[PDB]
Design a protein around this ligand. Structure first.
Ligand SMILES: Nc1ncnc2c1ncn2[C@@H]1O[C@H](COP(=O)(O)OP(=O)(O)CP(=O)(O)O)[C@@H](O)[C@H]1O
Ligand SMILES: [Mg+2]
Length: 214
């Protein structure tokens, strides 16, 4: 019996779309900082659930462990960053991951044009989009307490989609699945991941574990 799923498509805010095009169609060295940006997001989300659970300990019913997992998959060429942080509601996804303007976007594009290192992306308030330095497509699966599990996805080009996720349930948190570009497969290698975590993500505040398939 055929299943029916609803999909909603959203336009990125105009300057966010411009930034994504810049990131994708311009050569930048030092792309490895994408992972720092994603781990920083996870750490921030872990702080949020940690503090919320001081007010309401039942907010940890959906899982007490506060941690980050990194999962390279050489078979399907994906690198996944999973956290057990606060997650995002549907409204959070739509608002926070593309539709609302960020005040630093224009300044950042000017900085890049003038030769700034791509590592400055976080300072300008748009760190997530560093994912597109290495990924041709990004899928974000997320589960916030008191809301359903959702999947956000974009291959850039000006829009993203959101749908209720009918895949494997997560208790609470977010998974960012990077479908790596063919020339960026170094980020599936355990040595390289270890190197960049050590270099850029030394003060995370939560355990991080790298899972490596035999
Ligand atoms: N792992 C995650 N868990 C929960 N929310 C996340 C998330 N990753 C991203 N987000 C949401 O997406 C927003 C945008 O993330 P982004 O990294 O671009 O900016 P930011 O708010 O972290 C400032 P910065 O530029 O310093 O990183 C976050 O503020 C948060 O609301
Ligand atoms: Mg961030």
């Amino acid at each position: 019996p055929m299943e029916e799923e609803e999909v909603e498509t959203f336009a990125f805010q105009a300057e966010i779309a411009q930034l994504m095009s810049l990131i994708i169609n311009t050569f930048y060295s030092n792309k490895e900082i994408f992972l720092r940006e994603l781990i920083s997001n996870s750490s921030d989300a872990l702080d949020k659930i940690r503090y919320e659970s001081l007010t309401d300990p039942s907010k940890l019913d959906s899982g007490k462990e506060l941690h980050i997992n990194l999962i390279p998959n050489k078979q399907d060429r994906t690198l996944t960053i999973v956290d057990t942080g606060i997650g995002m509601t549907k409204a959070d996804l739509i608002n926070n991951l593309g539709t609302i303007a960020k005040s630093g976007t224009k300044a950042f594009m000017e900085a890049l044009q003038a030769g700034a290192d791509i590592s400055m992306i976080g300072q300008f308030g748009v760190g997530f989009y560093s994912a597109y330095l290495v990924a041709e497509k990004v899928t974000v699966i997320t589960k916030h307490n008191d809301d359903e599990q959702y999947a956000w996805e974009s291959s850039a080009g000006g829009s993203f989609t959101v749908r209720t996720d009918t895949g494997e349930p997560m208790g609470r948190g977010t998974k960012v699945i990077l479908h790596l570009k063919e020339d960026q497969t170094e980020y599936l290698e355990e040595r390289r991941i270890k190197e960049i975590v050590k270099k850029h993500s030394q003060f995370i505040g939560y355990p991080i574990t790298l899972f490596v398939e035999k």
